[PDB]
Amino acid sequence: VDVYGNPIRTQQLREPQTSRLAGLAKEFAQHPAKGLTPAKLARILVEAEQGNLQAQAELFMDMEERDAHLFAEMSKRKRAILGLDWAVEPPRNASAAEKADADYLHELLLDLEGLEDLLLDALDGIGHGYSCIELEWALQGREWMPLAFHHRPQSWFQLNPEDQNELRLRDNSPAGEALQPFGWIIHRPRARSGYVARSGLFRVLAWPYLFRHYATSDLAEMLEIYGLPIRLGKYPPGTADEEKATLLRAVTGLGHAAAGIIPETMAIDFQQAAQGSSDPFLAMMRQSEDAISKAVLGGTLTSTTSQSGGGAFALGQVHNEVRHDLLASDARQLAATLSRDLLWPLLVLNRPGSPDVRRAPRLVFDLREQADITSMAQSIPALVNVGLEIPSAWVYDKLGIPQPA
Amino acid sequence: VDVYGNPIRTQQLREPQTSRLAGLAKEFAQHPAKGLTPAKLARILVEAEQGNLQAQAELFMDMEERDAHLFAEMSKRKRAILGLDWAVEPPRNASAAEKADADYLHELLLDLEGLEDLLLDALDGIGHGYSCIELEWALQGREWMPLAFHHRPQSWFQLNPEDQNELRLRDNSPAGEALQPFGWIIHRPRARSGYVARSGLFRVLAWPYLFRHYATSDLAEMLEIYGLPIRLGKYPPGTADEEKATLLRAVTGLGHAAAGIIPETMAIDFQQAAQGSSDPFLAMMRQSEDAISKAVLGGTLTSTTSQSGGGAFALGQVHNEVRHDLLASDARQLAATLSRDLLWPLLVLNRPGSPDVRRAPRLVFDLREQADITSMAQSIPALVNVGLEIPSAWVYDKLGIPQPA
């Protein structure tokens, strides 16, 4: 059975759960981000907390699509994880059988195509708060294999009315449907303590995105209004409609027309419509950019060039440690969810026996940090000449040099 | 059969699929970018999401043509990949037969002309979200060969009404036509999780492009209006049409005419039409430039000179790591699509047997990063004198020095 203990029946693995819900596949996103206002966004968040995740997911998709800075930051964060080397390792002080099972799973994963896409789809849970991937199973003789990984939009799910922390499909029923065991991979990173609805990172970044959007739109309109000054023409009583239309045409053309003539009984005035500066909008956009960068990557230097020195070394150290521990946390969570959702079904479906869930293999990402080889090379001789016995295994491990074989 | 398992029939390889659709070849792009407004662009995106990819593809082509900064950034990104060395490597722990097949495919690819053009055409999927290249096959005796690679405009395809993730040709039918197996190379890089329509990078960059376009056009008009001030002439009652035309001519000429005379009963006033500055437009254009650079290359220094020091080292490290992992991701995706679409048909059509799809050869790009030879040279002697056995293979591999033969 799965790690959660739910009974597992192999009959349902032959067909995807969503196959019987063809209505979902034909849905088109409604794009709630267009014409968004603070009241509407607050309503969206409140209704999402009560189990209406569709609008929130669509809004998050639009938000990630429409913002270039948030796009770049999220892409950087995800590509940081995508570049890490991974391996499968048996349980602690494992035996020969457990070692063989771990090696077999490692072999299975190394050639498993689409793994990079699987990781990319799973990492969307950092922003959306949860990512669901459906597994398609097939039989190549006596062994079960995941034929393909299909990421499903977050708009397809909701919350259980009796459980705020449990996700369900949308099957036109108030209670939804429970997720099929051995049929989904669910990644739910925990940046904050709380329920699934409130756990998405995009919930924090929603407000700065709206601030930037409003500032940029207002700046664009103000750019549209500069240049020609607004001017108003006056006519005396007894002017006819033909002459008034002529005056309107003349006044409209005066902006691009260098000269014009009117009767002394008429008047036209110029007003300097805009008479403004863009500095407020720029400042607000910079504030939003800095907030988003700090929230996503934990720092701001990585996105913008620092125009100062002296403290650049301490800033670099802080940034490097923040990036390192953020990456470590994300990779550990991703490895945990992968080991929970993918490795266990393979182990229990392809290999004989019923191994304890306690001794199941765990996926591990390579979080080794490059060490300065020169410093170690110069330090070792003095220590060894003193008399200290430094194990060769530790030196190999820190330096990344593989053991002789 | 292909990697996707679809039955493959060699009869259809003799003619291109599009050959029977001569109407497509005669089509001319409609250039939707001219006279573009935010409402029109939003409509274009919305209709593209529903399966109307023609307008979106034409808009993306116009956008890449009309913007010099986006042009340069995309060219830099693609030429980064074009310069990487590549080789074909057999499956893991391969046998003699698999090694021979991989070597034969390597030989076939090395002399295969047009490979650089094939990579260039495939890399357009980064911006457009998908690039389709049609294969022309021929028989030189007993072996099949790709005679030529023909890139087709993205405006020729659409989405399956019953599948938002499946592409089809435009054959004047509502459902289109399914892509012929063994006849196309499809590259669909995945920057974000989502459907094919929303996966294009240009969708993110569309808005900053429009912002820059509007700012530059308004700045150009404002430049046109500076200089001569707008002036308005007045005449008293009883002025004749000849005299009014004369007054209009005089007022029009006063800008470039240093002097003029009019009756004391007439008046002319000067207004200082523009009385403005270009700073708002410059600031908006800089914002758009920075956004595009960050979205494309992950940084801004590579496109503009940094006017500060101190932190230049940390900024350079961040930029180098961002470029490295971005290039690695792009190259890995390109190699995956190439191995899926080009290597497998050659293996199954030119060589005997039916090798497992699991053991198929995979194209690999050279992602080795140059290591400082001096540091390694100075570090090795101390480590070896301590007693550590560092394999010569690892040193050769990191330093790029080939094995002795």
Numbering used by the authors:
A (entry chain A), B (entry chain A): 5 to 409
The authors write:
The JBD30 portal protein (gp32) has the same domain organization as portals of other dsDNA phages, such as T4, SPP1, and T7. It is composed of crown, wing, stem, and clip domains. The diameter of the portal channel at its narrowest is 30 Å in a virion and 21 Å in an empty JBD30 particle. The difference is caused by the conformational change of helices α12 from the wing domains and tunnel loops of the portal proteins.
